[PDB]
Amino acid sequence: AAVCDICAKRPGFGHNVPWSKKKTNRRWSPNIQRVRVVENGTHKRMNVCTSCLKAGRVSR
Amino acid sequence: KLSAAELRQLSGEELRNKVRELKEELFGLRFQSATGQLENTARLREVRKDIARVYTVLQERNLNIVDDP
Amino acid sequence: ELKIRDPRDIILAPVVSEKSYGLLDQNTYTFVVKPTANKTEIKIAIEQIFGVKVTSVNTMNRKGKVRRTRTGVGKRPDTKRAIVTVAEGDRIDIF
Amino acid sequence: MKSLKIKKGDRVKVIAGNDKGAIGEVLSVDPARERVVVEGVNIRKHHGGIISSEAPIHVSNVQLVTKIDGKDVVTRVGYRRVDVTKRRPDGSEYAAQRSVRYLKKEE
RNA sequence: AGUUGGUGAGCGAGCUGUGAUCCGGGGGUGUCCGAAUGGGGAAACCUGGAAUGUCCGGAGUAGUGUCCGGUGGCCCUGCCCUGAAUGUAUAGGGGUGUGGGUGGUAACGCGGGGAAGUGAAACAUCUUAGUACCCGUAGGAAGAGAAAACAAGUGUGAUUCCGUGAGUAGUGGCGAGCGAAAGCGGAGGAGGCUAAACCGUGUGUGUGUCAGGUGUUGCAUGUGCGGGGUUGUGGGGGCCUUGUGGUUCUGCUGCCGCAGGAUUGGCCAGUGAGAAAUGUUGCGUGAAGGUGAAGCGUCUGGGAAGGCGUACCGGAGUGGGUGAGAGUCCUGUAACUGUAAGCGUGGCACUGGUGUGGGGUUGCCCCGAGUAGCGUGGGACUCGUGGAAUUUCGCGUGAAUCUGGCGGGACCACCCGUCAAGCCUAAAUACUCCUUGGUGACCGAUAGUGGAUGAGUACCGUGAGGGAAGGGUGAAAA
RNA sequence: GUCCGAACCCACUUCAGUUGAAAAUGGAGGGGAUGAGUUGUGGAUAGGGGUGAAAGGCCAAUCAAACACCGUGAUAGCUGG
RNA sequence: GACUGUGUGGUGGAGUUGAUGCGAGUGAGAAUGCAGGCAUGAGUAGCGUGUGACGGGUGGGAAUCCCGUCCGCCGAUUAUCCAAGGGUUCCAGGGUCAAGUUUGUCUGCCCUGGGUGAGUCGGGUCCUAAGGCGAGGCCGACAGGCGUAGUCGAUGGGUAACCAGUUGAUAUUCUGGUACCGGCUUGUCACCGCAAGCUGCGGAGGGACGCAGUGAGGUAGCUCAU
RNA sequence: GGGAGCCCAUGGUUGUGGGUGAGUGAGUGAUCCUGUACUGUCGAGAAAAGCUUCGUGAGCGAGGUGGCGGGUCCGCCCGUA
Ligand SMILES: [Mg+2]
Ligand SMILES: [Mg+2]
Ligand SMILES: [Mg+2]
Ligand SMILES: [Mg+2]
Ligand SMILES: [Mg+2]
Ligand SMILES: [Mg+2]
Ligand SMILES: [Mg+2]
Ligand SMILES: [Mg+2]
Ligand SMILES: [Mg+2]
Ligand SMILES: [Mg+2]
Ligand SMILES: [Mg+2]
Ligand SMILES: [Mg+2]
Ligand SMILES: [Mg+2]
Ligand SMILES: [Mg+2]
Ligand SMILES: [Mg+2]
Ligand SMILES: [Mg+2]
Ligand SMILES: [Mg+2]
Ligand SMILES: [Mg+2]
Ligand SMILES: [Mg+2]
Ligand SMILES: [Mg+2]
Ligand SMILES: [Mg+2]
Ligand SMILES: [Mg+2]
Ligand SMILES: [Mg+2]
Ligand SMILES: [Mg+2]
Ligand SMILES: [Mg+2]
Ligand SMILES: [Mg+2]
Ligand SMILES: [Mg+2]
Ligand SMILES: [Mg+2]
Ligand SMILES: [Mg+2]
Ligand SMILES: [Mg+2]
Ligand SMILES: [Mg+2]
Ligand SMILES: [Mg+2]
Ligand SMILES: [Mg+2]
Ligand SMILES: [Mg+2]
Ligand SMILES: [Mg+2]
Ligand SMILES: [Mg+2]
Ligand SMILES: [Mg+2]
Ligand SMILES: [Mg+2]
Ligand SMILES: [Mg+2]
Ligand SMILES: [Mg+2]
Ligand SMILES: [Mg+2]
Ligand SMILES: [Mg+2]
Ligand SMILES: [Mg+2]
Ligand SMILES: [Mg+2]
Ligand SMILES: [Mg+2]
Ligand SMILES: [Mg+2]
Ligand SMILES: [Mg+2]
Ligand SMILES: [Mg+2]
Ligand SMILES: [Mg+2]
Ligand SMILES: [Mg+2]
Ligand SMILES: [Mg+2]
Ligand SMILES: [Mg+2]
Ligand SMILES: [Mg+2]
Ligand SMILES: [Mg+2]
Ligand SMILES: [Mg+2]
Ligand SMILES: [Mg+2]
Ligand SMILES: [Mg+2]
Ligand SMILES: [Mg+2]
Ligand SMILES: [Mg+2]
Ligand SMILES: [Mg+2]
Ligand SMILES: [Mg+2]
Ligand SMILES: [Mg+2]
Ligand SMILES: [Mg+2]
Ligand SMILES: [Mg+2]
Ligand SMILES: [Mg+2]
Ligand SMILES: [Mg+2]
Ligand SMILES: [Mg+2]
Ligand SMILES: [Mg+2]
Ligand SMILES: [Mg+2]
Ligand SMILES: [Mg+2]
Ligand SMILES: [Mg+2]
Ligand SMILES: [Mg+2]
Ligand SMILES: [Mg+2]
Ligand SMILES: [Mg+2]
Ligand SMILES: [Mg+2]
Ligand SMILES: [Mg+2]
Ligand SMILES: [Mg+2]
Ligand SMILES: [Mg+2]
Ligand SMILES: [Zn+2]
Structure with missing residues (x-):
């Protein structure tokens, strides 16, 4: 996945820019990790970005 | 005769x-x-117009636009 | 609920033609009926209207004729007609 | 839309057309296209057999005529408001205001 | 006083004035399809409720076939019960029906994705162009918006939009091209809330608190709700010197003070963004209407509005009709008037609903963190990676917090400005599928809409889609 | 995936047609004709893609990249007016 | 010079002239230009495989319509009936502008009216195949992709009727005769009773399956007949 | 039930009421029936429901139902030229 279930981080779109500068469309995906979470009392998977995982916005 | 607003002087069963x-x-x-x-x-x-009139009176009574006798 | 439903809403008009009058010899009556009425409903309606025992009801759907005029093609309404067979002596008066 | 200033049963005088000066009664009015039929003026054939009867003419070609002192005088019209009572379809009463036509040149 | 739409007449009616047709406003009905929603489906069709008294109510039949009406689509969400494997518990399951959603829409908006033909006389950077198209999603407008701003030595004081600055400074295979800002002139003109200290209000738990007081008096963490507070030559909390609208006269802090208190003043302030949102009375009206001036005579003509003669009105001589060119024949026009009604609407009064601070102080306390920065790979800025500020996305890394942070085109110092990482905000701006009125040195049937007529029709195509042609008798059908 | 040979499927030769009866056929013969056969109905694969016992074949009567609409009044140092 | 007369008629029936300015969708013979109308070829090519003849009728009009008689043609189809598709072309009466490759009194044309009858036939109310859609769900920046439970989907499975007659036009449909199936209800006989039954739910059986070939017993049919 | 030519007549390109008479034997013989039979065979030849029976992970349900012969009424929608 490339969308964070927390903070809704989503891919950006930009350019491959070679030495000749012949720009080509490309994507920057967020570092989405699928981890086990225990929310309230629910065990389930969630696709969580590493930024949220580092900030602790996700309960494991 | 073609019926008029005196149908409002009748009762539900006789209107039916x-x-x-x-x-x-x-x-x-x-x-x-x-x-x-x-x-x-x-x-x-x-005759169809009269049927329309009688249904009009019945529905106004049922919807309480005019108080039911 | 408003809008009392009368059995005479289903039976619209009788079919008058040479075939219908010939079928009158067999106690058979052709009526133009409401196109959404089934054989049982037509039978019950005829019984209630005429006080007549009905042995059989046969229905067909007849397509309306299409005629090309000024302003293009016109199409006459579709009709359903019930062919009602009456008991031996009951008879229905269509005038 | 409203009605015309000329109504059926009026006595009018023809002021334009082949029959200038002819005086007759308005036999019928056709408000939609503003044409009136006055007796014994526009005699033509209909259809049917012959039917030699009156054909409509434009309402602006006639004018209401009054008898002031023994001579027929064409006149225009005005309206005055008078208090009346109208009956609702159920039969109730209520006071309302209605217009009444009067001929000019006679007050 | 006529009337039962049009293409396109006579029957049989209603109005025969018991006032219709008609006109404005508001209701009733509204088959079937369509988000389509009981289920299915080849849109406008089909088919239903396990057995029980039947899904519920009614009608019908001896009874079943039948009829009429109601009910139940899905997803989100509120409330109640239950709680799996399994222990907590959750998922799930069963109720309830609390609210919301679905789909459509001409242009305009915002956020995101994003061409190529073309130009460069080839072409790849660049251009075209963030255009076409596409995705999401609004509103009557949207977005923006109350300085982590500009300025440059004084100063300006939210934002948007228009004109300039200026085709300038710049930028650019320095090619084709691209292209500012400050300042100034205008349109329009609001500023308001919050997080945090600090104080009132429960649960992972007391053993120290003159009236009072108990191993705790009310003692310790961190919640949910109240106040309080909202700024920058810093502010706020705290600590105090005072001040709350006159009080019935309640607990607490110290028999000082604080707060609840109550019809009543009240500077005020109000249906606004403004921590909010509930009745009665004062205006002209839009939708319909009402009134609405004043010419005859002759002549020629099928016909007079034309000619000739002669009068009138004009707050009305703008038009358009009428048998030919009408100010006075018709419709109107000028001017005035009515509007009952509206969900009426706008504004006022009343009701009704909501409510103060100033001065000193700095010991202390608070001032929005995975944020700002930094590195890197991209994007937007005149700026095409560069001396690269400012701004933005992905990935890493990661601060101070007032003696602080940020900006002033690398960077540092000083100086000046400003206080980011929370939110809401009218007006000036954009637009017309529509409604009403009006206009045209605009078209006049090969034109003007594709369409003056059965026109998105006939017709062509499996389909998306393409897509015509045909107006004129006369004053009157006579 | 035998042989001869109708239906059926095919399309080798020839003649005719070639403003045709027909935008690919007709006459006469010819190949297969129990098989890798043929055919009906419904379905699946879609455009830089499909499918192809492979000819760049076929994908709605012109396919070395279908058709329709849009960018669009593309561009054309060329031709015409 | 582009052009023109304030000359004079005709046609026509409602506008428009001169002066001086102002504004242009302001001038056509060419674009294998666009639209319409009409010539040229030309009364020319063709009239789409073929066998018609005659007598009579109808009629304003007959090679081409009707009737009859001869004759010829097809006959594994030039017959009969379905499916797909078409959609009123079907029947009766009236019609001869157009259409029909000629004529036309005729028509699959035009006009008016009429015509299609099912418990059993073919589909639905039953079943699934390929495949489609798909509650949740998983996947995917968005748009979307896939798919579970399910739910659709015949070209298949399941499923009770035949012969005769009748109309200008319909017929396992109507009518006659004689059957069958499912319901409801009723009469009668027999039988049940943690322990009737009914409906759900599944288990199993069954449905349930290839191709090729020969033979046997039959019947339809056909032929012949003192 | 169907099936020819004889009838005062019909009505004269017509249909009515009577007049219908026969029904057998042999030969031949299927692409149909027994038959998804039988034999051969590799390439190994749908699904689900109806149906029969079995219980009961569900409810209903009264001591009432379920069976076998007989009687009455009900049997829908679409297509049908
Ligand atoms: Mg590009
Ligand atoms: Mg880490
Ligand atoms: Mg039927
Ligand atoms: Mg119609
Ligand atoms: Mg009234
Ligand atoms: Mg009036
Ligand atoms: Mg009325
Ligand atoms: Mg539905
Ligand atoms: Mg549906
Ligand atoms: Mg519903
Ligand atoms: Mg039930
Ligand atoms: Mg919506
Ligand atoms: Mg390019
Ligand atoms: Mg170039
Ligand atoms: Mg070039
Ligand atoms: Mg806004
Ligand atoms: Mg301000
Ligand atoms: Mg300014
Ligand atoms: Mg708080
Ligand atoms: Mg006037
Ligand atoms: Mg005059
Ligand atoms: Mg701050
Ligand atoms: Mg910085
Ligand atoms: Mg960078
Ligand atoms: Mg740039
Ligand atoms: Mg930087
Ligand atoms: Mg500097
Ligand atoms: Mg905002
Ligand atoms: Mg046009
Ligand atoms: Mg013209
Ligand atoms: Mg034309
Ligand atoms: Mg079509
Ligand atoms: Mg062989
Ligand atoms: Mg064939
Ligand atoms: Mg060849
Ligand atoms: Mg040749
Ligand atoms: Mg061979
Ligand atoms: Mg398909
Ligand atoms: Mg090759
Ligand atoms: Mg092709
Ligand atoms: Mg290409
Ligand atoms: Mg372009
Ligand atoms: Mg060009
Ligand atoms: Mg040339
Ligand atoms: Mg001039
Ligand atoms: Mg020109
Ligand atoms: Mg020319
Ligand atoms: Mg031409
Ligand atoms: Mg010629
Ligand atoms: Mg010749
Ligand atoms: Mg020649
Ligand atoms: Mg010749
Ligand atoms: Mg010839
Ligand atoms: Mg021939
Ligand atoms: Mg011939
Ligand atoms: Mg013959
Ligand atoms: Mg022969
Ligand atoms: Mg033979
Ligand atoms: Mg049909
Ligand atoms: Mg017809
Ligand atoms: Mg036709
Ligand atoms: Mg026919
Ligand atoms: Mg002809
Ligand atoms: Mg004929
Ligand atoms: Mg005929
Ligand atoms: Mg089902
Ligand atoms: Mg399936
Ligand atoms: Mg879903
Ligand atoms: Mg099912
Ligand atoms: Mg099905
Ligand atoms: Mg037939
Ligand atoms: Mg039969
Ligand atoms: Mg029968
Ligand atoms: Mg089984
Ligand atoms: Mg098997
Ligand atoms: Mg044999
Ligand atoms: Mg039929
Ligand atoms: Mg038939
Ligand atoms: Zn995240």
């Missing part, structure tokens, strides 16, 4: 009987029209 009688009269008129009778063609529309 009026509906049934009007429907039967329209049935007879349609049969006459099919069979070649019924010189009086305007009644064939006026």
Whole structure:
């Protein structure tokens, strides 16, 4: 996945820019990790970005 | 006669009987029209208009636009 | 509920033609009926209207004729007609 | 839309057309296209057999005529408001205001 | 006083004035399809409720076939019960029906994705162009918006939009091209809330608190709700010197003070963004209407509005009709008037609903963190990676917090400005599928809409889609 | 995936047609004709893609990249007016 | 010079002239230009495989319509009936502008009216195949992709009727005769009773399956007949 | 039930009421029936429901139902030229 279930981080779109500068469309995906979470009392998977995982916005 | 706002002076059951009688009269008129009778063609529309009037009165009573007798 | 439903709403008009009059010899009556009425409903309606025992009801759907005029093609309404067979002596007066 | 200033049964005088000066009664009015039929003026054939009867003419070609002192005088019209009472379809009463036509040149 | 729409007449009616048709406003009905929603489906069709008294109510039949009406689509969400494997518990399951959603829409808006033909006389950077198209999603407008701003030595004081600055400074295979800002002139003109200290209000738990007081008096963490507070030559909390609208006269802090208190003043302030949102009375009206001036005579003509003669009105001589060119024949026009009604609407009064601070102080306490920065790979800025500020996305890394942070085109110092990482905000601006009125040195049937007529029709195509042609008798059908 | 040979499927030769009866056929013969056969109905694969016992074949009567609409009044140092 | 007369008629029936300015969708013979109308070829090519003849009728009009008689043609189809598709072309009466490759009194044309009858036939109310859609769900920046439970989907499975007659036009449909199936209800006989039954739910059986070939017993049919 | 030519007559390109008479034997013989039979065979030849029976992970349900012969009524929608 490339969308964070927390903070809704989503891919950006930009350019491959070679030495000749012949720009080509490309994507920057967020570092989405699928981890086990225990929310309230629910065990389930969630696709969580590493930024949220580092900030602790996700309960494991 | 073609019926008017004096239908509001009647009761629900007799208004429904009026509906049934009007429907039967329209049935007879349609049969006459099919069979070649019924010189009086305007009644064939006026009976439907009367049915419309009676339903109008019944529905206003049912919806409490006019207080039910 | 408003809008009392009368059995005479289903039976619209009788069919008058040479075939219908020939079928009258067999106690058979051809009526133009409401196109959404089934054989049982037509049978019950005829019984209630005429006080007549009905042995059989046969229905067909007849397509309306299409005629090309000024303003293009016109199409006459579709009709359903019930062919009602009456008991031996009951008879129905269509005038 | 409203009605015309000329109504059926009026006595009018023809002021334009082949029959200038002819005076007759308005036999019928056709408000939609503003044409009136006055007796014994526009005699032509209909259809049907011959039917030699009156054909409509434009309402602006006639004018209401009054008898002031023994001579027929064409006149225009005005309206005055008078208090009346109208009956609702159920039969109730209420006071309302209605217009009444009067001929000019006679007050 | 006529009337039962049009193409396109006579029957049989209603109005025969018991006032219709008609006109404005508001209701009733509204088959079937369509988000389509009981289920299915080849849109406008089909088919239903396990057995029980039947899904519920009614009608019908001896009874079943039948009829009429109601009910139940899905997803989100509120409330109640239950709680799996399993222990907590959750998922799930069963109720309830609390609210919301679905789909459509001409242009305009915002956020995101994003061409190529073309130009460069080839072409790849660049251009075209963030255009076409596409995705999401609004509103009557949207977005923006109350300085982590500009300025440059004084100063300006939210934002948007228009004109300039200026085709300038710049930028650019320095090619084709691209292209500012400050300042100034205008349109329009609002500023308001919050997080945090600090104080009132429960649960992972007391053993120290003159009236009072108990191993705790009310003692310790961190919640949910109240106040309080909202700024920058810093502010706020705290600590105090005072001040709350006159009080019935309640607990607490110290028999000082604080707060609840109550009809009543009240500077005020109000249906606004403004921590909010509930009745009665004062205006002209839009939708319909009402009134609405004043010419005859002759002549020629099928016909007079034309000619000739002669009068009138004009707050009305703008038009258009009428048998030919009408100010006075018709419709109107000028001017005035009515509007009952509207969900009426706008504004006022009343009701009704909501409510103060100033001065000193700095010991202390608070001032929005995975944020700002930094590195890197991209994007937007005149700026095409560069001396690269400012701004933005992905990935890493990661601060101070007032003696602080940020900006002033690398960077540092000083100086000046400003206080980011929370939110809401009218007006000036954009637009017309529509409604009403009006206009045209605009078209006049090969034109003007594709369409003056059955026109998105006939017709062509499996389909998306393409897509015509045909107006004129006369004053009157006579 | 035998042989001869109708239906059926095919399309080798020839003649005719070639403003045709027909935008690919007709006459006469010819190949297969129990098989890798043929055919009906419904379905699946879609455009830089499909499918192809492979000819760049076929994909709605012109396919070395279908058709329709849009960018669009593309561009054309060329031709015409 | 582009052009023109304030000359004079005709046609026509409602506008428009001169002066001086102002504004242009302001001038056509060419674009294998666009639209319409009409010539040229030309009364020319063709009239789409073929066998018609005659007598009579109808009629304003007959090679081409009707009737009859001869004759010829097809006959594994030039017959009969379905499916797909078409959609009123079907029947009766009236019609001869157009259409029909000629004529036309005729028509699959035009006009008016009429015509299609099912418990059993073919589909639905039953079943699934390929495949489609798909509650949740998983996947995917968005748009979307896939798919579970399910739910659709015949070209298949399941499923009770035949012969005769009748109309200008319909017929396992109507009518006659004689059957069958499912309901409801009723009469009668027999039988049940943690322990009737009914409906759900599934288990199993069954449905349930290839191709090729020969033979046997039959019947339809056909032929012949003192 | 169907099936020819004889009838005062019909009505004269017509249909009515009577007049219908026969029904057998042999030969031949299927692409149909027994028959998804039988034999051969590799390439190994749908699904689900109806149906029969079995219980009961569900409810209903009264001591009432379920069976076998007989009687009455009900049997829908679409297509049908
Ligand atoms: Mg690009
Ligand atoms: Mg880490
Ligand atoms: Mg039927
Ligand atoms: Mg119609
Ligand atoms: Mg009224
Ligand atoms: Mg009036
Ligand atoms: Mg009325
Ligand atoms: Mg539905
Ligand atoms: Mg549906
Ligand atoms: Mg519903
Ligand atoms: Mg039930
Ligand atoms: Mg919406
Ligand atoms: Mg390019
Ligand atoms: Mg170039
Ligand atoms: Mg070039
Ligand atoms: Mg806004
Ligand atoms: Mg301000
Ligand atoms: Mg300014
Ligand atoms: Mg708080
Ligand atoms: Mg006037
Ligand atoms: Mg005059
Ligand atoms: Mg701050
Ligand atoms: Mg910085
Ligand atoms: Mg960078
Ligand atoms: Mg740039
Ligand atoms: Mg930087
Ligand atoms: Mg500097
Ligand atoms: Mg905002
Ligand atoms: Mg046009
Ligand atoms: Mg013209
Ligand atoms: Mg034209
Ligand atoms: Mg078509
Ligand atoms: Mg072989
Ligand atoms: Mg074939
Ligand atoms: Mg060849
Ligand atoms: Mg040749
Ligand atoms: Mg061979
Ligand atoms: Mg398909
Ligand atoms: Mg090759
Ligand atoms: Mg092709
Ligand atoms: Mg290409
Ligand atoms: Mg372009
Ligand atoms: Mg060009
Ligand atoms: Mg050339
Ligand atoms: Mg001039
Ligand atoms: Mg020109
Ligand atoms: Mg020319
Ligand atoms: Mg031409
Ligand atoms: Mg010629
Ligand atoms: Mg010749
Ligand atoms: Mg020649
Ligand atoms: Mg010749
Ligand atoms: Mg010839
Ligand atoms: Mg021939
Ligand atoms: Mg011939
Ligand atoms: Mg013959
Ligand atoms: Mg022969
Ligand atoms: Mg033979
Ligand atoms: Mg059909
Ligand atoms: Mg017809
Ligand atoms: Mg036709
Ligand atoms: Mg015919
Ligand atoms: Mg001809
Ligand atoms: Mg004929
Ligand atoms: Mg005929
Ligand atoms: Mg089912
Ligand atoms: Mg499936
Ligand atoms: Mg879903
Ligand atoms: Mg099912
Ligand atoms: Mg099905
Ligand atoms: Mg037939
Ligand atoms: Mg039969
Ligand atoms: Mg029968
Ligand atoms: Mg089984
Ligand atoms: Mg098997
Ligand atoms: Mg044998
Ligand atoms: Mg049929
Ligand atoms: Mg048939
Ligand atoms: Zn995240």
